[PDB]
Amino acid sequence: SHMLIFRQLFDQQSSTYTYLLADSTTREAVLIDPVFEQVRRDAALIEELGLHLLYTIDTHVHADHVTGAWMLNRRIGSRIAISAASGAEGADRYLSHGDKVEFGTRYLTVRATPGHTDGCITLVLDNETMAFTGDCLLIRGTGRTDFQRGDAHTMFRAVHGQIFTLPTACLLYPAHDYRGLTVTSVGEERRFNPRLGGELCEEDFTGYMTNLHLPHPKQIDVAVPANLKCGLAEPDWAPLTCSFAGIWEINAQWLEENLRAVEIVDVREPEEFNGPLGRIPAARLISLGELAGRTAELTKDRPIVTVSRAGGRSAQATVMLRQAGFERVANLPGGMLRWRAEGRVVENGS
Numbered sequence: 442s443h444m445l446i447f448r449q450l451f452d453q454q455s456s457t458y459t460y461l462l463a464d465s466t467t468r469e470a471v472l473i474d475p476v477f478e479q480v481r482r483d484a485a486l487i488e489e490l491g492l493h494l495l496y497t498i499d500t501h502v503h504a505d506h507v508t509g510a511w512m513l514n515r516r517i518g519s520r521i522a523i524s525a526a527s528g529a530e531g532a533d534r535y536l537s538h539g540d541k542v543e544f545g546t547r548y549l550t551v552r553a554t555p556g557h558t559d560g561c562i563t564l565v566l567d568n569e570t571m572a573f574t575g576d577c578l579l580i581r582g583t584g585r586t587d588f589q590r591g592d593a594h595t596m597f598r599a600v601h602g603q604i605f606t607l608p609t610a611c612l613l614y615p616a617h618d619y620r621g622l623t624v625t626s627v628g629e630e631r632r633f634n635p636r637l638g639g640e641l642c643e644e645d646f647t648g649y650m651t652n653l654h655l656p657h658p659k660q661i662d663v664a665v666p667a668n669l670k671c672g673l674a675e676p677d678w679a680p681l682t683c684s685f686a687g688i689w690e691i692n693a694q695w696l697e698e699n700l701r702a703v704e705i706v707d708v709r710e711p712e713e714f715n716g717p718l719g720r721i722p723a724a725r726l727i728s729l730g731e732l733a734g735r736t737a738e739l740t741k742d743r744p745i746v747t748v749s750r751a752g753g754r755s756a757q758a759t760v761m762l763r764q765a766g767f768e769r770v771a772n773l774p775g776g777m778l779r780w781r782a783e784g785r786v787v788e789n790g791s
C-alpha cells in the first residue's frame with residue numbers, strides 16, 4: 442500500500458547479492474539469499490530500519506557461500522524458506538511454483554526456474570516491476586549447468602517460459618555478478634543475452650554451455666553440505682550489539698550496573714571532561730588526539746568502553762584501539778548526552 446523498502450547488498454567474498462524487501466506500511470520484511478558471514482550486518486540493517494524479518498528465502502542450494510538462513514533464524518526468529526524441489530532439510534516453509542510469500546500488503550510469487558540446480562526458483566514482485574532470478578539468469582549470462590542436477594535444456598526452457606514471459610521493463614536481480622553490474626531487465630536479456638537471447642535456439646545454448654569450463658567455487662566442499670541443512674553449524678564480556686556501520690556498542694544499563702567491571706576511557710577535550718556535562722565516575726581521560734600515542738597505559742586484562750559527547754568521537758576511538766591490538770572494546774552510543782538524559786550517574790555535572 443505504501444512505499445517498498447528495497448536494499449541490494451553484496452558479499453565481496455562470494456560476489457553474492459542479498460536482497461532485503463519490506464512493506465513500509467507494516468515494516469514486515471523478507472531477505473533473499475542471505476550470506477552467513479554477513480549475518481551481523483544484515484541483522485543490524487534490519488534493526489536500524491525498524492523492520493521485522495518474516496522470512497529468509499534461498500533461491501537454490503548454493504555452492505559458493507553458506508546461507509545465513511539458520512543463523513538468522515536462531516538470532517532474530519526469521520523463518521527459513523527454500524524450494525521443495527531443492528531437497529534441503531530444516532526449513533520452516535517449502536516453496537513450490539505459484540506459491541505467494543506475503544509480507545504486509547506486498548508479496549512475491551514463486552516461479553520454478555531449474556537448470557542451474559533442480560531446485561532453483563525465481564521470485565517475482567507482486568507488481569512485476571522486478572524479479573529475483575537466483576543463478577538461473579545472470580546479467581548478460583546464465584548460471585553454470587555443469588554440476589550435479591544441472592541441465593542446460595531445462596535452463597533454456599525455464600528462462601524462456603518463466604522469465605522472458607515477464608513484462609519487458611521488468612528488472613532482473615541475480616544472485617551473483619562478477620563485473621560490478623547490479624541489474625538487468627527482461628528486454629535486454631531477451632535481445633542481448635549472448636547464450637540464449639536473440640534468435641539462439643535450445644541447441645545453440647546447450648552447445649555453448651557444454652563448452653564453458655569454469656573453476657568450481659572456492660567454498661564448494663563446505664557450502665553445499667551446509668546448505669543441504671539450511672546453513673547449520675560473538676563477544677560475551679558485556680551485552681553487546683554491532684551497528685550497521687560496524688561499531689560495537691555496549692548496553693548502557695549493564696554498564697551502569699557494572700562500572701567497576703570495565704575501564705572507561707573519556708576521549709573528549711580536557712575542557713569537556715571538566716565541563717558542564719560532567720563525566721562518568723572513574724573515567725580515564727585520554728583525549729582522542731592523544732589516544733593513539735598513549736595506548737600503552739591501557740591494560741588488555743580488562744575490556745574498554747569509550748565515551749565522548751554524543752558517541753561519535755568515541756566510536757572512532759574503538760577503531761583506533763582495535764587497530765592497536767585491543768579486542769574487548771565497545772562504544773557507549775549516544776555519549777554523555779544520552780547518559781544524562783537517561784538519568785544515569787555523573788560526577789561534576791551541572
Ligand SMILES: N[C@@H](CCC(=O)N[C@@H](CS)C(=O)NCC(=O)O)C(=O)O
Pocket residue numbers: 454455504505557576579582583584585617655656657658659660
Ligand atoms: N570463482 C567463483 C565461482 C564462479 C561461479 O562458478 N559462479 C556460479 C554461481 S554458483 C555460476 O553459476 N556461473 C558463473 C558464470 O557464469 O560466470 C567463486 O569461488 O565463488
Ligand SMILES: [Cl-]
Pocket residue numbers: 749750751752753754755776
Ligand atoms: Cl562525540
Ligand SMILES: [Fe+3]
Pocket residue numbers: 501502503504505557576584
Ligand atoms: Fe549457484
